[PDB]
């Protein structure tokens, strides 16, 4: 009975203040120069794109490369709006589940209607995998279609659910420091747990690779 | 008032953190090559010294402004203050 942890009971509030300012604000962090040589703070933004434009280009190699100049705009928005919110009292728009159901469905259904305007038969004859055995036709095409319509829900809900899960352990491990007016040795160890956990919460960049990329595979496979 | 707020960012870019190229701005581009980062430096203590070509004081002022702007909205909810001052 040496080190008694404490807790504080307080509501954890994802309120909704004025959003249409907060969305526009990580656009003005990135400038664009009309010059040949630039000014050594855009120049490391301009290099960072020319890496990861050479990995969502290499797989496709089609005349579906026209689509890929948009997919690098999709990575900078939720790459920024997940990285701004680590600050003391900032607010992330990708916390709320509303816009992510408007980021999945106008993009996911832009893929199944891409081959249906050109191929019209073999896009969803990709439901036929192989040299058909007899015992498992109805066990297959009720499975590979129930794992198609999961994909818009599978794409949005994986983003909202772990981003907000980062924010609660920021509060709760952090709030247990404030309410630790018992023995002062254990206060540092909870603080040292925080400054490790904030390094893990720069996997909010790592979770945007797993949103543009499984949009490519959900584009490359259909087209 | 639109030309008033637009001439705020074009002053806090070309001096604090920006002054790109495209001649008619060529010597204005090298004006940021020395940079006003030496002017921006003295606020922290000394330690963010890496601002030479990845410029911290150019960026870390906006993000320090966006924190204290969002401290105002939260102030009404988390009151907590007694009939006194803190330590």
């Amino acid at each position: 009975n040496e080190n008694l942890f404490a807790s504080f009971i307080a509501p954890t509030m994802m309120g909704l203040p004025i959003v249409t300012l907060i969305i526009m604000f990580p656009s003005l962090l990135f400038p664009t120069p009309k010059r040949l040589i630039n000014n050594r703070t855009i120049s490391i933004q301009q290099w960072l794109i020319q890496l990861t434009s050479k990995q969502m280009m290499a797989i496709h190699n089609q005349k579906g490369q026209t689509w890929s100049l948009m997919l690098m705009s999709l990575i900078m928005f939720i790459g920024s709006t997940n990285i701004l919110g680590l600050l003391p009292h900032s607010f992330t728009p990708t916390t709320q589940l509303s816009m992510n159901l408007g980021m999945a469905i106008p993009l996911w259904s832009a893929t199944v209607f891409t081959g249906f305007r050109y191929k019209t038969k073999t896009s969803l004859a990709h439901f036929l995998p192989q040299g058909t055995p007899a015992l498992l036709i109805p066990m297959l095409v009720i499975i590979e279609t129930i794992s198609l319509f999961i994909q818009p829900v599978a794409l949005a809900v994986r983003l909202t659910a772990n981003i907000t899960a980062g924010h609660l352990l920021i509060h709760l491990i952090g709030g247990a420091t404030l309410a630790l007016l018992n023995i002062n040795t254990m206060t540092a160890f909870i603080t040292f747990t925080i400054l490790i956990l904030l390094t893990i919460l720069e996997f909010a960049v790592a979770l945007i690779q797993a949103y543009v990329f499984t949009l490519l595979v959900s584009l490359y496979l259909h087209d | 008032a639109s030309v008033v707020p637009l001439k705020d960012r074009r002053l806090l870019e070309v001096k604090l953190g920006e002054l790109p190229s495209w001649i008619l701005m060529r010597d204005f581009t090298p004006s940021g090559i020395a940079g006003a980062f030496q002017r921006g430096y003295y606020r922290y203590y000394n330690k963010y010294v890496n601002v030479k070509k990845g410029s911290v004081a150019g960026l870390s002022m906006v993000l320090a402004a966006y924190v204290v702007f969002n401290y105002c909205r939260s102030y009404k909810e988390l009151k907590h203050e007694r009939l006194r001052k803190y330590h």
């Binding site: 010059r35 040949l36 040589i37 026209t66 | 190229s21 001649i23 060529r26 090298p30």
Partner: peptide, 24 residues
């Protein structure tokens, strides 16, 4: 001209084209 000269005067020798020319 200068090193930091222009984004259109360097657009004479090195080329630009119409939509979907540069494959890589």
């Amino acid at each position: 001209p200068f090193d930091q000269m222009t984004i259109e005067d360097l657009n004479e020798v090195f080329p630009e084209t119409k939509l979907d020319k540069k494959k890589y």
